[PDB]
Structure formats: C-alpha cells, structure tokens
Paper text:
Mincle recognizes its ligands via a calcium-dependent sugar-binding site, containing a conserved EPN (Glu-Pro-Asn) motif, and a hydrophobic groove on the carbohydrate recognition domain (CRD), which are in combination the major characteristics of Mincle. In Takifugu rubripes, one of the first vertebrates whose whole genome was completely sequenced, a protein sequence bearing the EPN motif and a hydrophobic groove was found (XP_029706534.1).
As trMincle was predicted to be a type II transmembrane protein, we constructed the extracellular domain of trMincle as a soluble recombinant protein followed by column-based purification. A calcium ion was coordinated with Glu-Pro-Asn (EPN) and Trp-Asn-Asp (WND), two well-conserved motifs, suggesting the typical sugar-binding pocket observed in other mammalian C-type lectins was also present in trMincle. Furthermore, one glycerol molecule in the media interacted with the EPN motif within the hydrophilic pocket, and hydroxyl groups at C1 and 2 of glycerol formed coordination bonds with calcium ion, which is similar to the reported sugar-binding mode of mammalian Mincle.Fig. 2 trMincle is structurally similar to boMincle. Moreover, the molecular dynamics simulation suggested that the trMincle CRD can create a typical groove similar to a mammalian Mincle.
Numbering used by the authors:
A (entry chain E): 47 to 180
B (entry chain A): 45 to 180
Write the structure that this text describes.
C-alpha cells in the first residue's frame, strides 16, 4: 500500500487488488497493449461481474485485453486464459459486415453497452490493469 | 490489512485513490440531491486537495458535480467539509454566473476545448463523484 503512491501520482487507481490506468489518448488495440506492457502491466482482464460493472461505470468506450484466436471466433485474455464468463453486448461478437474484428472493446453508447468485437487497427481509449496484491 | 476497510466499498463499486474511496454515480441528479446520496453512504461530494487528485478527476472524461459551493452570492467558495477554497482549477473564463443566472454549484466539465471546474445552476443535473477519506 506504500508501494501504490508512485502509481497514484501517475493517475492509476486501485480496485480489488489491481491497479488500473485509463489512457488520455486513443490508439490501436496493439499499440494500446504496448503502452500497458511498457508499464509492466497489460490490457484489462475482466475476471468477475463486479469487475465488469466497475468497467461499465466509467461510461467510456475502452479497449480491453481480450482477443480472438486467429479467425476461430474463440477468445483468449492477454494473460493466456480462455474466455469463460462473457459480457457481450447485444448481437456481438459479429465480424460486422464481413470485416475481421479480432479485438474487443467495451462499448458505451445509449441502448448499446458491453463488449464488442472491433477491427484491431481502429482507435479507442484503453484501460491497463496490473495485479498488485495476491 | 487495509482490505477489511476497502472490500465492502469495492463490493459496491467504489475504488481507491491516495487516501480515499471514490464513487461515480450511475444516475444524474441536482447538486443537492447528488450530495444527499454521498451523505447517505457515509461520504460527501469529492473534495479536490491536490493537482494529482484534479488530474485523476479530469481523466475520467466525464462531467461531474464536485463538493464545492458558493458562499451565498459572494463569489467566494467553500468545500463541503467547510474548508475554504485555496488551490483552484477553474476552466477558462470561469466562474462566471453565465448569462446573469445564479451559478452556485461546481462541476468538473468535460468538453472538447474546455476542461476544468465550472460554476453551474445547482438545480441542473449531472453525474456526481463521492469521496470518502478512509485513511489518515
Ligand atoms: Ca482483472
Ligand atoms: Ca462487432
Ligand atoms: Ca480529496
Ligand atoms: Ca459557469
């Protein structure tokens, strides 16, 4: 907890044993992830309903750390764990209009909230997560 | 350690920054009813005490009521804990009693060219941020 002060000074904040960072620029999924990795973190991994509610309450469209396995329409978190519990928004994931949508955003729009597969080269604000406590 | 203090608030969606727990509402409300919610939860509207805390507030990219209110019509300001305003982060041209109307309550405004505090009519609605200072 004394260890958290330099993170707070950089604008990270603490929820349920992880530190989180919300970007102030948008970027592609891969470059977003590169920022998080450079900070010793990764894109956010949603492990519980409470964490999804925390994510949603920022009212912000955000890249998160979930990516398709090639074109198989199966999904894996950035730490290598397989997708189990999911929070896809209505009608997602869908490879919209036949385009390859391999990366996952939390979408925040009126009538439409939750995860969406999106073209990875599109840009979004992004959320990093770093596990601190065991 | 500190988790016995924190986990019941994490369980309600609060989150921890510096010595405080913070709550972002999921409904909009008037400044006074926003405050009433924070008070009911054992907290108050957010009080900005440092540049780092202002940067934290601003990075949520969200217009939010905060715990700063005018003293009557005197154009002086006091935080909800009774402390006088010292360091400030007003957006450009604020506070201004816009168009002659009484703007006694303070929001953090998030718009494309303009960020920072704004005085606004208290009866208008915004999302709000509560703060509960939990650690000494
Ligand atoms: Ca997580
Ligand atoms: Ca999609
Ligand atoms: Ca404060
Ligand atoms: Ca104003």
């Amino acid at each position: 907890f004394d260890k958290l002060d330099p993170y707070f000074q950089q604008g990270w904040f603490h929820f349920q044993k992880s530190l989180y960072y919300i970007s102030s620029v948008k970027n592609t999924w891969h470059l977003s992830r590169e920022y998080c990795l450079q900070e010793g973190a990764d894109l956010a991994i949603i492990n519980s309903r409470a964490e999804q509610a925390f994510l949603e309450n920022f009212k912000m469209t955000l890249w998160i750390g979930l990516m398709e396995q090639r074109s198989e329409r199966t999904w894996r978190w950035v730490d290598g764990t397989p997708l189990t519990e999911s929070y896809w928004s209505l009608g997602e994931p869908n490879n919209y209009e036949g385009r390859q949508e391999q990366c996952v955003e939390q979408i925040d729009r009126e009538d439409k909230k939750g995860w969406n597969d999106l073209v990875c080269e599109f840009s979004n604000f992004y959320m990093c997560e770093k596990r601190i406590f065991p």
